[PDB]
């Protein structure tokens, strides 16, 4: 407890609180916009999924993790990564893709020799169908004839909650050629090729649109807390500072008096 | 009926129906 150190700490916490309150407001803005654009996206994405649940798809006999590049959003990344390692283990060949640098840095080292591609520039600007199409294209143009894949992301629920979820990618044009698909006739073996490609971009887009909503609401929340903790810390250090300031003077003065009286 | 793109080419599906809309030759065709 040195008036010097105390002051050193106050100095760095007052800035933290400032930068942290700023980051909160920016996020809450990004979140607000994201929450809205998410309304349509769900209906659209849930629509894309309307075919497969409405009618079975399994697989006889690619893990995609989505998040972002920026941290300071609680456990957005660690969650998907956690579930990502879980799959790769329980499993059949293993190959992976990470959208958002954070995934490529987290569920990484242990599994680099288990990578296909990775994506950057995710999260700063709102995601687009266009970005999803790049991800899809990049995959189709890959030598990985994946038979089945899963997409792991954070499904928004509220500003104070989200849930890491998984979505099956039976994109296997081959798998979409099972018994259950006998109900739908007048389907060229290659009309599906177009159908699957498309529904692949839709699912990547959906996860992407859910992800930024979860991310911006969690960064907002995390930065609200951080800022409030900072201020509290500020209030305490200040009060600790004054107690110390008063005791040093008193202490230094009693010392002078003692010496003087002894004479 | 569900029809959407951003807003609520592409695909169409009849099971409930859902319509989902998002080199020179292709461009010509579109224009």
């Amino acid at each position: 407890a040195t008036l010097k150190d105390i002051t050193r700490r106050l100095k760095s916490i007052k800035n933290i609180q400032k930068i942290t309150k700023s980051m909160k407001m920016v996020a809450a803005a990004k979140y607000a916009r994201a929450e809205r654009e998410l309304k349509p996206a769900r209906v659209y994405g849930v629509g894309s999924l309307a075919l497969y649940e409405k009618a079975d798809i399994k697989t006889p006999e690619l893990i995609i993790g989505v998040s972002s590049d920026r941290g300071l959003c609680g456990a957005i990344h660690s969650s998907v990564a956690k579930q990502m390692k879980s799959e790769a283990a329980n499993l059949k060949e293993v190959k992976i893709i990470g959208v958002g640098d954070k995934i490529r840095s987290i569920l990484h080292r242990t599994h680099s020799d288990q990578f296909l591609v990775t994506f950057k520039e995710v999260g700063r600007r709102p995601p687009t169908f266009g970005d999803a199409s790049v991800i899809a294209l990049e995959l189709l143009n890959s030598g990985y004839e994946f038979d089945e894949g899963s997409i792991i992301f954070n499904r928004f629920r509220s500003v104070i909650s989200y849930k890491t979820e998984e979505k099956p990618i039976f994109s296997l044009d081959t798998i979409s050629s099972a018994e259950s698909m006998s109900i739908y006739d007048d389907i060229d073996a290659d009309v599906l090729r177009n159908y699957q490609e498309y529904s692949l971009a839709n699912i990547i887009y959906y996860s992407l649109k859910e992800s930024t909503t979860s991310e911006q609401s969690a960064r907002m929340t995390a930065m609200d807390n951080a800022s409030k903790n900072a201020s509290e810390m500020i209030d305490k250090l200040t009060l600790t500072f004054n107690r110390t300031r008063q005791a040093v003077i008193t202490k230094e003065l009693i010392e002078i008096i003692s010496g003087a009286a002894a004479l | 009926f569900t029809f959407a793109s951003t807003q609520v080419s592409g695909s169409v599906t009849v099971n409930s129906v859902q319509l989902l809309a998002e080199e020179i030759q292709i461009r010509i065709e579109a224009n």
């Binding site: 640098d101 490529r104 591609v117 990775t118 994506f119 950057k120 520039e121 995710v122 700063r124 600007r125 709102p126 995601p127 687009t128 169908f129 266009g130 970005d131 199409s133 790049v134 991800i135 899809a136 294209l137 990049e138 189709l140 090729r193 177009n194 490609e197 498309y198 692949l200 971009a201 | 793109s5 080419s9 592409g10 809309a21 998002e22 080199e23 292709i26 461009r27 579109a30 224009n31």
Partner: peptide
């Protein structure tokens, strides 16, 4: 197709005729 193009790419062109690009590749 046969020309190397895929369908997403077709949809891309068609949709534009009638849309970000932030994403960046990290291939290693």
């Amino acid at each position: 197709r046969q020309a190397g193009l895929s369908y997403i790419r077709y949809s891309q062109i068609c949709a534009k005729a009638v849309s970000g690009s932030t994403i960046k590749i990290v291939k290693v």
